[PDB]
A paper describes a structure:
The mutations in R7 and R7-2 (Phe77Ile, Phe229Ser, Ile102Phe) result in further optimization of activation energy. However, the most striking result came from a crystal structure with 12 different [name] molecules within the asymmetric unit‚ into which substrate was soaked. In this structure, we observe both configuration A (three subunits) and B (one subunit), as well as two additional configurations (hereafter denoted configurations C and D). In configuration C, Trp50 is rotated back to a similar position as the designed conformation, except it is rotated such that the NH of the indole ring can hydrogen bond to the catalytic Glu101. The four subunits in configuration C all had product bound, and were the only chains where product was observed. Four subunits were observed to adopt configuration D, in which Trp50 was disordered in-between the well-defined configurations, supporting the idea that these conformational substates exist in equilibrium. However, in later generations (R7 and R7-2) evidence for turnover was only observed with configuration C. By R7 and R7-2, configuration C (which was the only state we saw associated with product in the crystal structures) becomes the dominant substate sampled, with configurations A and B sampled only rarely.
Computational design of [name] involved construction of a theozyme to catalyze the chemical reaction, which was then grafted into the scaffold of imidazole glycerol phosphate synthase (HisF) from Thermotoga maritima. Catalytically essential residues from the initial design include a base (Glu101) that facilitates C−H bond cleavage, an H-bond donor (Lys222) to stabilize the phenoxide intermediate, and a π-stacking residue (Trp50), which was designed to stabilize the transition state and favor substrate binding through interactions with the aromatic ring of the substrate. This initial [name] design (Round 1; R1) catalyzes the cleavage of 5-nitrobenzisoxazole, with 103-fold rate acceleration over the noncatalyzed reaction and a turnover rate (kcat) of 0.018 s−1.
Author numbering: 2 to 253
The structure:
Amino acid sequence: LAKRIDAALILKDGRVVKGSNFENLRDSGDPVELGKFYSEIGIDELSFWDITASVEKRKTMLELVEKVAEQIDIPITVGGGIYDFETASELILRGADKVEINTAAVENPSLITQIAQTFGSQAVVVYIAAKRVDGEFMVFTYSGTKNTGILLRDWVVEVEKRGAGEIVLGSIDRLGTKSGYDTEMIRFVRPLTTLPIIAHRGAGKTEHFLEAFLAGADAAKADSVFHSREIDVRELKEYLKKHGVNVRLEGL
Ligand SMILES: N#Cc1cc([N+](=O)[O-])ccc1O
């Protein structure tokens, strides 16, 4: 395939947290206008990740999905507080192409075969959060705090086997850093699974993305780095092409 540049939008109350620095938008903080803007300038897939806990927070997502699905041309993934089949089913049907699950996946791994059987494996993204514990990659859950004792070697083969469509590979050690994708972790996972692998956490500069794809990543996601305008998405794509990565450009 080619390699994707996925962009990720963190939501509270259907708002984009800290918004964005594109002064040309009408509502920097509006996910719909931001998301559709990223789809006009190079992003290949978008993530809508909701940090809302609240009472009517399942509605605010089903709302925004509906508004987003009529407007945005590229694939959309949703995750944030998705713990059961009800919530995913309702989200895919309201307009979500893929639903992300994590803790609920590790706690009942058949929720992914469940979502898969109904909506197709392509609709199921398993986010795996891992950090080194005593020289050994472990899967963590609950926002990367609960050391589940499942080592990643095995979770990556289980996830594939249970029917997931793609994995987001997030290195907890890189949260907030801007040193680069954990390319050791990517290289460690790469032979364990034929599934598409989305690199996440670390991105700080252009060249980090070239590193991520040589480590075997099928895609790289970042967020703040694009919204702050540290890395201009179009620049990022001309670079990746300059040095032999297969990425889709536009050319006007
Ligand atoms: N994808 C993703 C994602 C996950 C987390 N998270 O599992 O805390 C936060 C922000 C994100 O964009």
